[PDB]
Amino acid sequence: VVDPFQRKFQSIGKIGIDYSRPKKLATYKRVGYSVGLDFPNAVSMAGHYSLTDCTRAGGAAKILM
C-alpha cells in the first residue's frame, strides 16, 4: 500500500472507479493537486507566489499558479 505521506501528495482519482463515497468540495479545495514552482529567472516573477512548499499539499490554487 501507499505511504501516509505519499497519499497526501498524490492525487484524487475519478469517482466510479477510485472511490465509492462521493467527496466534499472542501477536500478538492484543500488537498487536490500539489505542484511546486521552479526558481524564477526574472525580477518580475519572484515575489508573487511561494516556492515549493514542504509538508503541505495545496490543491486547485496551484493549478492557477
Partner 1 sequence: MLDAFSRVVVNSDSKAAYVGGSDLQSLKTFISDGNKRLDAVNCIVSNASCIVSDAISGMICENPGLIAPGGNCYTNRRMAACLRDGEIILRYVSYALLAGDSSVLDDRCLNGLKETYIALGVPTASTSRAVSIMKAASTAFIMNTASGRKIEIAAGDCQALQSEAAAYFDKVGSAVD
Partner 2 sequence: MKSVITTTISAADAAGRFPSSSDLESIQGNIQRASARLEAAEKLSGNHEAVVKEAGDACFAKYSYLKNSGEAGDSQEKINKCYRDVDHYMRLINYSLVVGGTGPLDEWGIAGSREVYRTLNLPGSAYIASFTFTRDRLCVPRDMSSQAGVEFVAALDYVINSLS
Ligand X SMILES: C=CC1=C(C)[C@@H](Cc2[nH]c(/C=C3N=C(/C=C4\NC(=O)[C@H](C)[C@H]4CC)C(C)=C\3CCC(=O)O)c(CCC(=O)O)c2C)NC1=O
Q: Which residues bind partner 1 (CB under 8 A)?
A: 14-16, 22, 25-26, 28-29, 32-33, 59-61, 63-64
CA distance 59 to 26: 10
What's the chain's Rg over C-alpha atoms? 15
- Please say whether the beta carbons of 32 and 56 come within 8 A: no
CB of 48 to partner 1, least distance (A): 19
CB of 1 to ligand X, least distance (A): 8
CA distance 13 to 36: 20
Binding interface with ligand X (CB under 6 A): 2-3, 5-6, 14-15, 22-23, 25, 28, 39-40, 46-47, 49-51, 53-54
